[PDB]
Amino acid sequence: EEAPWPPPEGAFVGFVLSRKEPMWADLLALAAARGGRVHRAPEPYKALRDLKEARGLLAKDLSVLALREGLGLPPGDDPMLLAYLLDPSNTTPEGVARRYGGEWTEEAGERAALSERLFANLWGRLEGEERLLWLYREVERPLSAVLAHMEATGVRLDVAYLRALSLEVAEEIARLEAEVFRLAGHPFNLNSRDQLERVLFDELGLPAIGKTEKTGKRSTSAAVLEALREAHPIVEKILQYRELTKLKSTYIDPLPDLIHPRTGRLHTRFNQTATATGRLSSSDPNLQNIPVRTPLGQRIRRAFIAEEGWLLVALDYSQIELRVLAHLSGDENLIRVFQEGRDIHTETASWMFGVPRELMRRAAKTINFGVLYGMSAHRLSQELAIPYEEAQAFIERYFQSFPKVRAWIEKTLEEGRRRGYVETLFGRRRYVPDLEARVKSVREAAERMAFNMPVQGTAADLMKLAMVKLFPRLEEMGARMLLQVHDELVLEAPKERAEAVARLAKEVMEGVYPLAVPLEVEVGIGEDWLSAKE
DNA sequence: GACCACGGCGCA
DNA sequence: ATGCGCCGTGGTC
Ligand SMILES: Nc1ncnc2c1ncn2[C@H]1CC[C@@H](COP(=O)(O)OP(=O)(O)OP(=O)(O)O)O1
Ligand SMILES: [Mg+2]
Ligand code: NA
Ligand code: NA
Ligand code: NA
Ligand code: NA
User: Fold this and answer.
1) Which residues touch strand C (CB under 7 A)?
2) Angle at the Cα of A217 from the Cα atoms of A212 and A223, rounded to 5 degrees
3) What are the structural domain ranges in chain A?
4) Buried (b) or exposed (e) across A227-254, using 16+ Cβ within 10 A?
5) What is the CATH number of domain A153-269?
6) At A6, is the secondary structure helix, strand, or coil?
7) Overall fold of domain A1-152
């Protein structure tokens, strides 16, 4: 079925890259398949100009590359998106191909023919599934195009700043290390958890708290060291060393080396079919886990800056998962809190009775989260420095204040056992087979994954939809969408329009989809990521 | 050179 | 006793 290039319109494209990252890859081959007929392009780059849309497996990748080359080529249909909506465990072409009667190879033609077959088989599986079809048409397909532009745009990084920070951090690392060696009486590789384990529990007299999952080594995790804070002066220094070496090795050092030559900016990949809940993920580099919670983290956030003459706009959905929970469960007390414009964490702790709003909120905050994950009392203790007794109680009072949440959890599990899957507000599905496992530990783990999904997944849907609606508006205002961090959006705007952009973006996000409770958005504007988050 | 399992930890 | 992706160590091929 070999015909000369070019191919008819609407043909499924197949491409081969020298590496997985579209912004860094050489385009090795380009082929298209239509009516079982395969066309292979003599010169991939030149041939790119003939396409008016990228339709096929991993379409966003080819689109990102086209944008890199100055071509306005939009991603279209992608069988990966259909498969992922059918079952979120469909995360790769290799896995998908197998499951649905194909073979993911390394040739552009075969890949183009794989795309065709796969789209047929998957689309047919989606007839009658009108809610998934809605997700595909109204969210995932348009979203892929938005993500393609975010990836091609990238974000500006202050390299000189990071270079200087690295040298300072290094100095502090050496001092902590030297001190650790002093307390240990001898040098050793502090980055080796095995060597550290012997030092702490064999050479020093320190008690071993917990063991590691796979190999049963005496754990040296932060949880363990924290609980060992005042059993010996050395552990305190090890925690500081760990924080500093984590951020230096993971962010401070690698990021400056990843700046693209043409753009002078940092380009991440927004993976659209990689999670079980419907969230995006970010990789190569991951810009969804840039530090922020510690002073040194905040200093790292400062490295992310606006282009000169522009500003960063950062928008954050307040407590979106709790709000989704209020809607899903219908809990009146919970809904009331939000509709009255109250702050749940300050309200939730108010039910340490006798205080409308005086007491630490980070406890009520720790609790609310613990509810989302199925956290047990024993965990609240370590995560609150509170005796096991006062933890188990804190949890019971919660389900008294918010009864319908428990009812919703129970109902979600029961339905999940029935149908074999649970679903988001919009109908996104996750299959959770182990709900009927006969080992309690396995069964209950499955239950936590099961009831968390509708909460995490609805919040993901709301944000995705918000991005879809917001993107066209930004273009008209001459603004850029840069990053998404699950419940946050980071935009780039010309200094003069930043304020106007902030108003608009905020409103679009808050109105994305009216629920039983309002969606509130914190918005900030600044020269860098740190100052943009108020 | 590439890849692996593990423990560990950054963010939502 | 939620969801990700990346790091160094210790290791194979
Ligand atoms: N330590 C932690 N453990 C688990 N999940 C966490 C977490 N920190 C954040 N998350 C996830 C779970 C939900 C989300 C919470 O985001 P915020 O941290 O900003 O807390 P918010 O609800 O906004 O309270 P406010 O900011 O008003 O004090 O991030
Ligand atoms: Mg917040
Ligand atoms: Na499955
Ligand atoms: Na990509
Ligand atoms: Na997955
Ligand atoms: Na990688």
Assistant:
1) A 189, 191-192, 194-195, 249-250, 254, 271, 274-277, 279, 281-286, 288-289, 372-374, 376-379, 441, 445, 448-449, 452-453, 456, 486
2) 50
3) 1-152, 153-269, 270-319+460-532, 320-459
4) bbeeeeebbbbbebbbbbbebbebbbbe
5) 1.20.1060.10
6) coil
7) Nucleotidyltransferase; domain 5 (3.30.420)
